[PDB]
Nucleic acid binder design. Structure first.
Lengths: 65, 177, 114, 83
RNA sequence: UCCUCCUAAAGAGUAACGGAGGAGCACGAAGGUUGGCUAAUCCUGGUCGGACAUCAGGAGGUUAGUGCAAUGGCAUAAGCC
RNA sequence: CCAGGGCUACACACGUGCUACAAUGGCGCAUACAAAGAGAAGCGACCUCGCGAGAGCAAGCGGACCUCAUAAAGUGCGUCGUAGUCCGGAUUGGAGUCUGCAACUCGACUCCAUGAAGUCGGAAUCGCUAGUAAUCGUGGAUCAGAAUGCCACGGUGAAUAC
């Protein structure tokens, strides 16, 4: 690489709010806590929960005996 | 980095026991990752260009190169030799660092991830994804706010098919609707 | 500071800045602060991480931005696929609930251009 | 809307004819002037020609439309354009 | 007045109020050298981005380029840095 | 005579009003001051549940006695700190209560979610000389339901007339 024009590039140690630690080399300036990470995520665990696209026979027959 | 090690164990063993292989040079490896930032408004104002270059230096690792317009078209009112876009190419160690940063910390924040497309592939092993907004990379202070300024990433593997590069990216624990 | 939809403007009060998430208005943000026990006087500026994730799980159990966007766009789309009158007024660009359309209903149909 | 302690509404003639056409199985468009009566689960599988004031417009009843009423699928005021 | 093509009849030359186009300049780099590089056009994917700017890959071989008209030429590049 | 539709449509133009564009305000909490009314197939306490619209049981009252009915601005405490904003409440989606055979065309209200134009309005033009204008709330007729209109009642209450 060129020796001056690039900024710093430090290994910083983030901790997800779910708890997982990650030692990654980047250029933030501080160890920053993300809210969600790729572990204990909705879609990476399988928690996407697609809506029932019309349960109108369940709705009606729930409403009326 | 560590996903280079995870590649050299798990991904290469899964691609060995996925396709019929003799040699370890059949199995593809990702050569490079290229960021593009297609600014296009540098014919109007000029400081947006170097601030978008600063955003690419913030998101990626190294400094972006300002690319020039090759063919001049009046339909976008552009001229030969104008600084019209920006690009970074990361290969090797910094590519593996950016790849683990894309997987681990970036795509979790992509604002209603309903599963990104899998028909995106090229025909010779290239993925291409265009983020609508650059916030999802956490390296921004957010206190600076300029514009939207989204970018796009093009990953180039030496795979031949799209089965090949698609299963190779799926070996890297990729979401893939 | 960083919640699943977008950020929170850190200088406002508690319920006032919690409402800025798409998907929760004022009484429901009041229910969130009741569930965390957070008084409304503290702003988001003072809020350390313990109160932040105690806010995060309680707003996670509530319905949030992206799936609500999907639900409203899908329900409108489904009514339009049906063939009813409500979806038909969603197709044309006129109000759906029986408004006066002789002279008013300008918000649904835009500026008074021609 | 109707209160949900009362239940749904269906006119006696419409109910009896729908039950007769479901039992005997013939799926011709039966004609009615009873737009207000709400559809039921019993009513999928039949095109029905409902009144609108001039003609009987036929609707095919599918899965989704069971909560709505019959008059939602027959536009009364036919408007084509001012120019 | 000068330049390029054709008539010009396979050396040069060769007319008409014959058929066609251009010049009265530019550049201290657009010159010299060393080192490097190879086009045009379509196809696919990709944020704004669109027939068409930017990016990545593929077919294809000079159909591209030459400071400026035409002929000859150019890959060892006379093209580009 | 009967069933359904239409009078409620909608590129458009006008009149009359309500509401906002905010700090002389918004919101939360606490607290004070009236008048005129209306009421029998009606008016509905108190009590049980509901965030609620309400529902259930349900005494009193042909009314100076019961019932709607709690008047709100005001007064006091804190925040908001000049932003399309804790201003605005239009539109839309879901969930509901009530009345009536029936709430889709086309009722009203509650609740949750969203938060449109709007930063005082060109050429013009209107009303008003005092408990008046301006601002604030209540009530009644019509009525199964459905007022931002109409008709009243009152609370704070100006400026100017050379």
């Amino acid at each position: 690489m060129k020796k001056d024009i690039h900024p710093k590039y430090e290994e910083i140690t983030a901790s997800c709010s779910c708890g997982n630690v990650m030692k990654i080399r980047s250029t933030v300036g501080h160890d920053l806590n993300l809210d969600v990470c790729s572990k204990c995520h909705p879609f990476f665990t399988g928690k996407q929960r697609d809506v029932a696209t019309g349960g109108r026979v369940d709705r009606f027959n729930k409403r009326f005996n | 980095a560590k996903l280079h090690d995870y590649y050299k164990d798990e991904v290469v063993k899964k691609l060995m026991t996925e396709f019929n292989y003799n040699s370890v040079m059949q199995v593809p490896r990702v050569e490079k990752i290229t960021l593009n930032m297609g600014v296009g408004e540098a014919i109007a104002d000029k400081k947006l260009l170097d601030n978008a270059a600063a955003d690419l230096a913030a998101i990626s690792g190294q400094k972006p190169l300002i690319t020039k317009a090759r063919k001049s078209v009046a339909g976008f009112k552009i001229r030969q030799g104008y600084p019209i876009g920006c690009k970074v190419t990361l290969r090797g160690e910094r590519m593996w660092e950016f790849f683990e940063r894309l997987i681990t910390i970036a795509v979790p924040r992509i604002r209603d991830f309903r599963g990104l497309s899998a028909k995106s592939f090229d025909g010779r092993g290239n993925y291409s994804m265009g983020v609508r907004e650059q916030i999802i990379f956490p390296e921004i202070d957010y206190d600076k706010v300029d514009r939207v300024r989204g970018l796009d990433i093009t990953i180039t593997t030496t795979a031949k098919s799209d089965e090949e590069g698609r299963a190779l990216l799926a070996a890297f624990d990729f979401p893939f609707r | 500071a960083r919640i699943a939809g977008i950020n929170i403007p850190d200088h406002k009060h508690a319920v006032i800045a919690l409402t800025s998430i798409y998907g929760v208005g004022k009484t429901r943000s009041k229910a969130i602060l009741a569930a965390a026990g957070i008084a409304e006087d503290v702003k988001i500026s003072e809020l350390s991480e313990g109160q932040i994730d105690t806010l995060r799980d309680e707003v996670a159990k509530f319905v949030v931005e992206g799936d609500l966007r999907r639900e409203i766009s899908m329900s409108i789309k489904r009514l339009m696929d049906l063939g009813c009158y409500r979806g038909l007024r969603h197709r044309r660009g006129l109000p759906v609930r029986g408004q006066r359309t002789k002279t008013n209903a300008r918000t649904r149909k835009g500026p008074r251009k021609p | 809307p109707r209160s949900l302690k009362k239940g749904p509404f269906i006119d006696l003639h419409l109910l009896k004819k729908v039950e007769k056409a479901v039992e005997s199985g013939d799926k011709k468009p039966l004609r009615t002037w009873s737009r207000r009566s709400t559809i039921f689960p019993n009513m999928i599988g039949l095109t029905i020609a409902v009144h609108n004031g001039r003609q009987h417009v036929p609707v095919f009843v599918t899965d989704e439309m069971v909560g709505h009423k019959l008059g939602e699928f027959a536009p009364t005021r036919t408007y084509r354009g001012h120019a």
